[PDB]
Ligand binder design. Structure first.
Ligand SMILES: O=P(O)(O)OC[C@H]1O[C@H](OP(=O)(O)OP(=O)(O)O)[C@H](O)[C@@H]1O
Ligand SMILES: O=P(O)(O)OC[C@H]1O[C@H](OP(=O)(O)OP(=O)(O)O)[C@H](O)[C@@H]1O
Ligand SMILES: NC(=O)c1ccccc1
Ligand SMILES: NC(=O)c1ccccc1
Lengths: 464, 464
């Protein structure tokens, strides 16, 4: 990895574009005004990409050679980079101040700021925009996941009177449906801020290496079938597949994909009659989890519950909602995103089924079907020093007021009523508003403040 | 990287779920029935992740300890992985056959097949489903990028009579808007199958390492401003910023973001009047490229053109369309995806503006706003051998015939009319359709067939 090759190409040319005699460029990241965002993932970038000796004689040469061909021109700032190598032993003269990871912050507030700490390095502040803005991704995943958790909490509370098991209601199925191995780990770690169930194993090592938990692991799974492990038995032997599988995993939870041929037949006749005897004998700690995987997600879930309720003893909980026996549950893991998840719990509630009965698995909806656009994650220069004079800078495009950026030096504060406010134009120095919530997390090649994954989970808790 | 920890959790439990005495699991990947897909990206995965000694004693131990905690139970196949280490020095006993990279294939056809080459490693075929299915991403980027090339080619030909400069008409802006560094390199590389313009520098090294080009680099850029390099001059000094930047880059093309305060004022008054003398003097190979970045993309592009058309000498080309002078161009880099690109070129054509005048930059639309759903990329078991008996396996969910999978051993063939057909149930062996178009690209830890990026580009060409 070479930081000199980890920027947008045009930024290579920006050192020649700033006003002459500029000693300071100061920039900030916000999710421009999903009303509130979980700030998560910066610590990963700081440690993996930004800290320590990130410049070498070899990396400068490599970059020089690539850019000469990429631009067909000599534009690369070799002197600037060499200056960092010789004076700071290749450590970046940058200070980054950030809100604590896990914090839940309303849109349109500063989340972190970046400035250069040596006047020679005015151009470096925005060199690293590209790499830092990629924080949009863990922010957005953590945020969207938490939003699903609110929906789940609401309906679980209403239909059952408590939140037991909430942490296990939205399982990460996204490993194959993301764009890379690196994304898999990042995105899976962001979902674990809110939940504990994951099949995206890559999340575990990222968390262990960059954040840390008191528990051996941040996330957990159970045995579960796929179509290959059912269909391999042959079309006439789905029942043999089911029987083999539940018997192999008789004393832990086991999920069994039941739609290879006919989900409704599988529920009513295979599980509901042929194999009923192997299900009703199961422990509460070791249920059968039936998994539909096709059809309209709402129609399929409701029809499956209807079938099961006629084949197995249903109770009615203290809230008046129907509850399957504790050895039998359902997981819907097809076509699940925040919208369909809402439609399913609502449809269940309508038909008087407790949310205790259901869990969800989500792949692309959880980890891939998200864009920098969703929270308007944006990094802009708000302050420069030119000829020893600070000036407040911003954009304000005529046709789009939503793209107006903030002016001057920024600070984030608690308001008297307990909300958040971003003070502009260095007004935080007036001290009318208690201390700045941003803390120095990076300074001159060193990570200066870290959060464990346990702290982050606490910071990102739901209200209730 | 540890391949033992690079699968979906549930797959760790699958060795215990297949029928007893299963000696072969054979699986295939398709983009289930955007009618044609560019096959691209498998070779990256084969080389980075799958080839060579990928199993060590330390990797087995690491995986054992993680899964013990992750499952709260000892499901992990330590013996199976140890077998591979001991018998094959950690090389995967797997055969992969694939269509050549860059090939453009209709949906619903076999793109690659995976099978185990040792009876003991029957569980390995689908272990690596998760890693291989991630090929959806380069496939989808390359396909969506090529679909945009078809639109640009159509309108450039209609409005100008040729395709000169087509390969520079869609510029990759997506480095900051993807989910990780790895994703950036992969996705930028896929766009470069079709185009030559990129700011996602990560794509360059990937191609050089994994594919190779005759040219020193596969992609190119030019100097360009961002809002920090305009706004840093102070709101009253936008003109000074503009003058400085174009003079710094007076003999190469330069893109200058023009909407910091008022895009229409910048075009009409600043470029059109105050600084006009510094633009009309420029070379045909060093145009000023004016960049709007806000507002309704179509309305903004049309108004920008109307403004410039009144300030600069417009000509009418041989097709009857309006053409700006060669030292002046426009690039629309905001809100660009396949739909808005189509809207802009059609609206331009409608108002009699040649597509010669316009280029596009696309970020998330190009590299992030894409999902496994778009092409229905899917991996499924189609054939197994159990008790020495080969059987054709498949899924066929009652509520979704689209998800029916293919049966038996598969082959890809040319039809008598020269189209593509995938033969099922080993029927390729009858030789009624000539030889299988898939080639063995991986066998027993080795990459056995490779393509340079130049071969891939040639395979991926448009009809014209
Ligand atoms: O985030 P998503 O992309 O929605 O992932 C969830 C889906 O993934 C798996 O199916 P598979 O990989 O076989 O895809 P398919 O169900 O569409 O065939 C799983 O059995 C779910 O159907
Ligand atoms: O295709 P996209 O993913 O949108 O990327 C392209 C956009 O990215 C940059 O803006 P910035 O990073 O400031 O985003 P913003 O214009 O939304 O603020 C650029 O100046 C374009 O507006
Ligand atoms: N555990 C599962 O059922 C699962 C299915 C598909 C993808 C990931 C996980
Ligand atoms: N070169 C550019 O104008 C650009 C803009 C935004 C993102 C990447 C590149």
């Amino acid at each position: 990895f070479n930081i000199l090759l980890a920027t947008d190409s045009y930024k290579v040319t920006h050192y020649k574009q700033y006003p002459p005699n500029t000693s300071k460029v100061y920039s900030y990241f916000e999710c421009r005004e999903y009303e509130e965002t979980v700030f998560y993932g910066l610590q990963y970038i700081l440690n993996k990409y930004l800290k320590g000796k990130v410049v070498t004689k070899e990396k400068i040469q490599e970059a020089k050679d690539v850019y000469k061909e990429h631009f067909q021109d000599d534009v690369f700032n070799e002197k600037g980079w060499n200056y960092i190598l010789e004076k700071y032993d290749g450590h970046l003269p940058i200070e980054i101040k950030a809100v604590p990871e896990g914090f839940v912050i309303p849109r349109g507030n500063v989340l972190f700021t970046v400035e250069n700490t040596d006047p020679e390095c005015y151009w470096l502040t925005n060199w690293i925009e590209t790499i830092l803005v990629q924080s949009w991704y863990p922010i957005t995943v953590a945020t969207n996941s938490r939003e699903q958790k609110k929906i789940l909490a609401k309906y679980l509370l209403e239909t059952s009177g408590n939140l037991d098991g909430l942490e296990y209601k939205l399982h990460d199925f996204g490993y194959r449906g993301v764009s890379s191995q690196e994304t898999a780990g990042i995105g899976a770690s962001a979902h674990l801020v809110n939940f504990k169930g994951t099949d995206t194993v890559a999340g575990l090592a990222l968390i262990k290496k960059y954040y840390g938990t008191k528990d051996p692991v941040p996330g957990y799974s159970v045995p579960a079938a796929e179509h290959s492990t059912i269909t391999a038995w042959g079309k006439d032997h789905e029942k043999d597949a089911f029987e083999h599988i539940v018997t192999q995993f008789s004393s832990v939870p086991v999920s069994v994909v039941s739609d290879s041929y006919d989900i409704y037949n599988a529920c009513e006749k295979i599980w509901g009659e042929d194999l009923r005897h192997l299900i009703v004998s199961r422990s509460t700690q070791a249920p059968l989890i039936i998994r539909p995987d096709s059809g309209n997600p709402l129609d399929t879930v409701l029809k499956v519950l209807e079938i099961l309720g006629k084949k197995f003893p249903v109770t009615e909980n203290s809230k008046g909602y129907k509850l399957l026996p504790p050895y039998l549950r359902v997981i819907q893991g097809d076509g699940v995103d925040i919208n369909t998840l809402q439609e399913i719990v609502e449809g269940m509630k309508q038909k008087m089924w407790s949310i205790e009965n259901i869990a969800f698995g989500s792949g692309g909806g959880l980890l891939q079907k998200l864009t920098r656009d969703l929270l308007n994650c944006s990094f802009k220069c708000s302050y420069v020093v030119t000829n020893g004079l600070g000036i407040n800078v911003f954009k304000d495009p005529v046709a789009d007021p939503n793209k107006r950026s903030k002016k001057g030096r920024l600070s984030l504060h608690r308001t008297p009523a307990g909300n958040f406010v971003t003070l502009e134009e260095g007004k935080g120095d007036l001290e009318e508003y208690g201390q700045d919530l941003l803390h120095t997390v990076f300074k001159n090649g060193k990570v200066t403040k870290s959060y464990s994954f346990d702290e982050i989970r606490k910071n990102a808790q739901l209200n209730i």
